[PDB]
Design a protein around this ligand. Structure first.
Ligand code: ZVN
Length: 435
């Protein structure tokens, strides 16, 4: 697998041992052949599990999630998918890795899709080798793959709001359940209902993931309410998965705004990953998987694939060449390669709005391409009246950096800056000039 111009898809079923058994064997062989190697982890939680599997081997951990003292003589680097893409965009020097290993390579966040595009292009050019590790490669149509022990699959109506009656099976269970919901707000309602019935509930989402995941190990729980982030290697000691089979989808309308469409069906890859949290112990047969809807290919037209092209158009590859998306996922977006390429100064603004501003890729692009500088926030208040952001059924308001109270009305509206309480609080701080 380690020879140039070759990209291998390691598609062993979930729990077949890709991370704890296969990955260290590959790393040993790469060190023996003096291949400059990069290992890409989706989250800091997976990066911690990888250190445990690779203990003793010389690996340079480019993250604060691991507390290790490096020798300085490591030729294997380990970082998150987002860190790799961010370093490529920034003026920092990134080595031309001979071997590129991506764990949980199904991750659909814009930075992950961009990393897959960059790596597969280098492989197509004959410069590097690559290994993509996932049970669900792009375009998979099987939502019920193999497992370490048999699973009981049941199609059933799953509540998406609080309930008083009609779903006794949910609360009559005496084990641990992981429940996948389409949004943070929907998880809040279901968590409140379960807490009122006497259940101990933990909630997980993108922003709270590392902090709250530790609670699944440190304390006793009955239910874990999670968004789609738990599809990326999160391991639980549970006996049941309740899957609404629904997700939200960011959609760019008329090329001028982003809305959060849905809830709508998940892809087969997401359903199989959600089901894959159980049936992992060969000594425990009969874990349950209750699903409340069907699958569909809802990644077509999803804004993350357009955002990945915005990222790839601003990454240097060779002279005027631009990396293409990984071939099995390149048709998810209708886009012209190079159409998002920015000049040096606007590109720096684009990077700072994403890194420091913490804004979505699409929104950072509209601001930077309009010739606006990072600290200029006049655009957060000069949009049309239909762009007014609402908080508790009344327009959201902030004190501008000038000391003036104004209604939040951005020139470009992206639903992700106000999808929950935490998101709107962070966007208000940005509009006020606080970061
Ligand atoms: C050794 C060599 C280079 C880097 S960059 C880095 N970080 C950058 C961003 N993520 C957190 C830490 N850590 C190292 C360690």
């Amino acid at each position: 697998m380690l020879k140039k111009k070759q990209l291998t898809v390691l598609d062993l079923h979930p729990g077949a041992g890709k991370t704890r058994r296969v990955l260290p064997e590959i790393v040993r062989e790469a060190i023996k052949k003096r291949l400059r190697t990069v290992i890409l982890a989706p989250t800091r939680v997976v990066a911690a599990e990888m250190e445990e599997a690779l203990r003793g081997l010389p690996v340079r951990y480019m993250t604060t999630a691991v507390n290790v003292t490096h020798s300085g003589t490591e030729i294997v680097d380990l970082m998150c998918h987002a860190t790799f893409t961010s370093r490529l965009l920034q003026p920092i020097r990134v080595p031309n890795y001979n071997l590129n290993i991506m764990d949980e390579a199904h991750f659909t966040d814009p930075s992950s899709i961009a990393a897959r595009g960059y790596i597969s292009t280098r492989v197509e050019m004959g410069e590097a080798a690559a290994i993509f590790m996932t049970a669900t490669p792009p375009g998979t149509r099987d939502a019920f793959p193999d497992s370490n022990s048999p699973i009981m699959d049941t199609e059933v109506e799953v509540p998406e709001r609080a309930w008083s009656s009609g779903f006794d099976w949910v609360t009559d269970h005496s084990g641990k359940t992981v429940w996948f919901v389409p949004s943070v707000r929907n998880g809040n309602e279901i968590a409140a209902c379960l807490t009122k019935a006497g259940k101990r509930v933990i909630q997980l989402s993108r922003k709270t993931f590392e902090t709250e995941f530790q609670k699944t190990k440190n304390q006793e729980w009955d239910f874990v309410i999670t968004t789609d982030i738990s599809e990326m290697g999160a391991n639980f000691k549970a006996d049941r998965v309740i899957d609404s089979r629904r997700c939200l989808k960011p959609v760019i309308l008329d090329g001028e705004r982003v809305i959060l469409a849905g809830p709508m069906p998940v892809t087969h890859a997401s359903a199989a990953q959600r089901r894959g949290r159980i049936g992992r112990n060969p000594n425990k047969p009969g874990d349950e998987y209750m699903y409340g809807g069907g699958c569909a290919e809802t990644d077509e037209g999803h804004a993350h694939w357009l955002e990945a092209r915005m990222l790839l158009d601003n990454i240097y590859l060779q002279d005027g060449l631009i990396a293409s998306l990984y071939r099995p996922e390149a048709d998810k977006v209708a886009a012209i390669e190079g159409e998002f390429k920015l000049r040096t100064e606007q590109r720096k603004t684009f990077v700072e709005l994403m890194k420091r501003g913490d804004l979505p890729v699409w929104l950072a692009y509209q601001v930077a391409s309009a010739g606006i500088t990072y600290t200029d926030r006049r655009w957060c208040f000069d949009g049309t009246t239909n762009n007014t952001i609402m908080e508790d059924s009344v327009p959201a308001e902030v004190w501008t950096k000038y000391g003036e109270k104004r209604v939040l009305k951005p020139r470009w509206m992206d639903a992700r800056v106000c999808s929950d309480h935490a998101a709107l609080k962070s966007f208000k701080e940005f509009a006020a000039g606080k970061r």
